[PDB]
Design a protein around this ligand. Structure first.
Ligand SMILES: C=C1/C(=C\C=C2/CCC[C@]3(C)[C@@H]([C@H](C)CCCC(C)(C)O)CC[C@@H]23)C[C@@H](O)[C@H](OCCCC#N)[C@@H]1O
Length: 255
């Protein structure tokens, strides 16, 4: 039965805009990483919550990484068809609430199953579980995060599906504090319809009209990661002098 409408003119334009937005906002050569505060990796095979919190050795580097990435996500979001129709208030509510989620999704591009790390072109910029603990996070966030990255990789998304997924994440009508939920939902539906249509015309075999449900379940998983991150960030923020180690944008988004 399984009908396969072709992508409309407009849906094809939405995909090209999203791909363009992504390519303008994600440098796959990682060439800006030398501009961040440098990574420092203290000795911590233990690897000791007391010590991690005392030093927070990887925090200035990873806060700079995330802060830069939030800036990129803002730029990506402004190019999503319809985002600019939203009030400024709703734009910002959507950005602040999705930031960490979009970062976790876009990080999949540097994540490698070779060794279960985020590898950004060189061993100074390879991030492992241990480097995240050295920024003051705990295994209750990191291990589910890695499971998420693996499950995502194993979907083998086309770049089209990947950018649609990021856009769908940002334009979510159920975020706390949004005012025009209906408009946001309309924007999201246009994107969701484009993704469903895409998978059905363009993603082979296909028996896997399972993929759209799989993608949606990733969005649910990201919600869980987002709350756990928020809880841990709050604990991190109790560490004296933590704020120095962050950035103004990070502080505003998560504080
Ligand atoms: C951030 C990205 C990358 C990796 C992402 C990682 C690996 C390290 C640990 C990180 C940061 C997790 C912790 C829990 C966040 C903690 C945040 C605070 C401390 C504020 O609580 C969440 C995502 C994780 C590299 C890369 O894929 C992109 O990098 C720059 C853009 C790439 C290009 N071009 C992407 O945006």
């Amino acid at each position: 039965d399984s009908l396969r409408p072709k992508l409309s003119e407009e849906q094809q334009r939405i995909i090209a805009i999203l791909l363009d937005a992504h390519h303008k906002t994600y440098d796959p050569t990682y060439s800006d990483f030398c501009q961040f505060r440098p990574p420092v990796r203290v000795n911590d095979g233990g690897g000791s919550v007391t010590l991690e919190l005392s030093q927070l050795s990887m925090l200035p580097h990873l806060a700079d990484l995330v802060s830069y990435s939030i800036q990129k996500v803002i730029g990506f979001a402004k190019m999503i068809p319809g985002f600019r129709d939203l009030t400024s208030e709703d734009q910002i509510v959507l950005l602040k609430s999705s930031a960490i989620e979009v970062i976790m999704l876009r990080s999949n591009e540097s994540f490698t199953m070779d060794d279960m790390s985020w590898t950004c072109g060189n061993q100074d910029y390879k991030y492992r579980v241990s480097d995240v603990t050295k920024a003051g996070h705990s295994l209750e966030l990191i291990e589910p995060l890695i499971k998420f990255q693996v499950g995502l990789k194993k979907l083998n998304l086309h770049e089209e599906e990947h950018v649609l997924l990021m856009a769908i994440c940002i334009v979510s009508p159920d975020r706390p504090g949004v005012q025009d939920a209906a408009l946001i939902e309309a924007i999201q539906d246009r994107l969701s319809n484009t993704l469903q249509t895409y998978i059905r015309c363009r993603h082979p075999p296909p028996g896997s009209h399972l993929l759209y449900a799989k993608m949606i379940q990733k969005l649910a998983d990201l919600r869980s990661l987002n709350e756990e991150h928020s809880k841990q960030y709050r604990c991190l923020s109790f560490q004296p002098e933590c704020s120095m180690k962050l950035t103004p944008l990070v502080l505003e988004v998560f504080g």
